[PDB]
Amino acid sequence: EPTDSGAPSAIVMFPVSAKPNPKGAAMKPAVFNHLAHEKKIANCETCHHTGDPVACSTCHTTEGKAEGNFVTLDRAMHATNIAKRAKGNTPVSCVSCHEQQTKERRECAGCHAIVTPKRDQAWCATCHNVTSSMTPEQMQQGIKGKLPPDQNEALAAETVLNHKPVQPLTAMQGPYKVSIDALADKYEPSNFTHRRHMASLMERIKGDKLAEAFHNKPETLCATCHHRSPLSATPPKCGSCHTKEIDPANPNRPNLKAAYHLQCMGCHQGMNVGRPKNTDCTTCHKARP
Ligand code: HEC
Ligand code: HEC
Ligand code: HEC
Ligand code: HEC
Ligand code: HEC
Ligand code: HEC
Ligand code: HEC
Ligand code: HEC
Ligand code: HEC
């Protein structure tokens, strides 16, 4: 399948710099699947914000220059907080649109209302992924904008085709139900439908390639809720980090009650759950007669 646009189906993107880089001091080049993107975004100018479709690096070099308003390659590819242009087009970055996706799509917006992205090495590597078949020489030529289109296409194509998404933990790999009773007092324990929740959440995003590329560890989705602890099938209790009472030390951290409310309710509201509403108290935990 060829692209409508006439662009290569997948493209390797290099760190175009005014500073010579004989040692290849750089991030691993990024492979952009143009075909898959263009099939999801009809407006070519959403990305090619100046109109004519040309490499962003023609204007956005690592150092920045006149043609790009000194907006560097780093900024053009990872900007967040991009201001809405009063007139004309509001450019997008790779990161901002991806971020847009998690906030605008109901199936993404529940977990992403409660997830604080790590944006660690694994996150960088999702984009910075050119096949290891790329040689230092090819790296040098791409940097100089002298890599032949056929070699670029071939490196990009190999990258796309050699990708194998990670096998996540099944909902059967987590507990079926969890009696959340760490604070049981005025109400009964909340009998959480742990497995049903996980399974419903995963089904809604099954096959999404953006989601699959960035959820790249078997337990990543478990970290949605079990955050700030090593990826694991048996994470520590919320109660191990969240104190019953506001802890006067480190710091502003929600106490346990708020941790549960903010987390459970935060997702429900993020993916517009019909029930329970945050005011449906006995739906999550029956009042104690
Ligand atoms: C896709 C959404 C990306 C993620 C996440 C990260 N980067 Fe990136 N960045 C990506 C592209 C398309 C490009 C341009 C092509 C290239 O690889 O050069 C870049 C550019 C950079 C650069 C500038 C070039 C360089 O000197 O190698 C750097 C320094 C860079 N990116 C760093 C970086 C880091 C550290 C990231 C994780 C925290 C990261 N990027 C994620 C797109 C994407
Ligand atoms: C963002 C999700 C994209 C949309 C939608 C479209 N394109 Fe694109 N294209 C974009 C990038 C990030 C790249 C790689 C540029 C790089 O630095 O290598 C491009 C590249 C092209 C090109 C090749 C430019 C060249 O290297 O000189 C062409 C001809 C092109 N794109 C055409 C094109 C058309 C017509 C679009 C709508 C059908 C379109 N693109 C949308 C990403 C984005
Ligand atoms: C030169 C003809 C351009 C090409 C090709 C690309 N960009 Fe660009 N970019 C250019 C200018 C002159 C400016 C500033 C315009 C203004 O409204 O200020 C921009 C700025 C951006 C930004 C916004 C940065 C921010 O507001 O902080 C982004 C994210 C951006 N550009 C992205 C981008 C991408 C991804 C490109 C290829 C698909 C690309 N630009 C090409 C000029 C030029
Ligand atoms: C919205 C306007 C986008 C822009 C800007 C960029 N990407 Fe993107 N990304 C977008 C969607 C909707 C998807 C899913 C496409 C589909 O098949 O469903 C993707 C996903 C990716 C992926 C994951 C899969 C793959 O192609 O490897 C990668 C790593 C990716 N996007 C990279 C990427 C880079 C490097 C970008 C700037 C050059 C970039 N994307 C911009 C939507 C948007
Ligand atoms: C809970 C079951 C999730 C759903 C459904 C979706 N995502 Fe997700 N995502 C989740 C977690 C816990 C993480 C890890 C954060 C970090 O520590 O790395 C992520 C991460 C992403 C990312 C990368 C981080 C970022 O750039 O913000 C992307 C781009 C992403 N997720 C996209 C995404 C999309 C498009 C979804 C709907 C189709 C989606 N996610 C659903 C957990 C969950
Ligand atoms: C699910 C989305 C919730 C909604 C809606 C409400 N609560 Fe909640 N609550 C939730 C959890 C998972 C827990 C932990 C239960 C425990 O035993 O560990 C709590 C806890 C409380 C508590 C403390 C425990 C108790 O006294 O038994 C209080 C008093 C409480 N919740 C009050 C409360 C009120 C009044 C709500 C409606 C306005 C309400 N909760 C909604 C989950 C959820
Ligand atoms: C939010 C939607 C969750 C996701 C996604 C996962 N889990 Fe979970 N889990 C979460 C809560 C609120 C609870 C209660 C914790 C507490 O301290 O009250 C749990 C608990 C567990 C446990 C403990 C079971 C037991 O004590 O009976 C385990 C072992 C567990 N969770 C595993 C687990 C795995 C492996 C996940 C991904 C497949 C996963 N959880 C996701 C809420 C959330
Ligand atoms: C220690 C290893 C943690 C465990 C286990 C849990 N959480 Fe946590 N969480 C912890 C920190 C250090 C922080 C504060 C971060 C900061 O910005 O101050 C929190 C924060 C929360 C919050 C607020 C929103 C957030 O940033 O994610 C909530 C809603 C929350 N935590 C909920 C929560 C739940 C329900 C837990 C068990 C499933 C849980 N946390 C465990 C660190 C620790
Ligand atoms: C998204 C990441 C969620 C988190 C965190 C929690 N819930 Fe949830 N819940 C979620 C969905 C999307 C729905 C609607 C139905 C669907 O699957 O599409 C619900 C539903 C509930 C309900 C009713 C059905 C049930 O399975 O019991 C309850 C009572 C409920 N949720 C409780 C609950 C609690 C106590 C949570 C934190 C421990 C919690 N949910 C987190 C999405 C997500």
From TrEMBL:
Metal-binding as UniProt keyword: yes
Residues engaged in binding heme c 4: 49, 56, 59-60, 75, 85
Top-level division of the source organism's lineage: Bacteria
Ranges of residues in domain Class III cytochrome C: 21-106, 210-285
Keywords: Electron transport, Heme, Iron, Metal-binding, Signal, Transport
Binding residues annotated for heme c 6, in chain numbering: 183, 185-187, 261, 281, 284-285
Known cofactor(s): heme c
Protein name: Nonaheme cytochrome c
A Pfam family assignment: Cytochrom_CIII
Residues the entry annotates as binding heme c 7: 193, 196-197, 200, 204, 264, 267-268
GO molecular function, one term: heme binding
Binding site for heme c 5: 108, 111-112, 118-119, 123, 215
Residues where heme c 1 binds: 27, 30, 34, 37, 44, 47-49, 59, 78, 94, 97-98, 108, 111-112, 124, 127-128
Binding sites annotated in the UniProt record for heme c 3: 37, 94, 97-98
Keyword Iron among UniProt keywords: yes
Residues that, per the record, bind heme c 8: 194, 222, 225-226, 238, 260
Binding sites annotated in the UniProt record for heme c 2: 34, 44, 47-48, 56
Cofactor binding notes: Binds 4 heme c groups covalently per monomer.
SUPFAM superfamilies: Multiheme cytochromes
Family matches, as InterPro entries: 9HemeCytC, Cyt_c_III, Cyt_c_III_dom, Multihaem_cyt_sf
Entry binding sites for heme c 9: 227-228, 238, 241-242
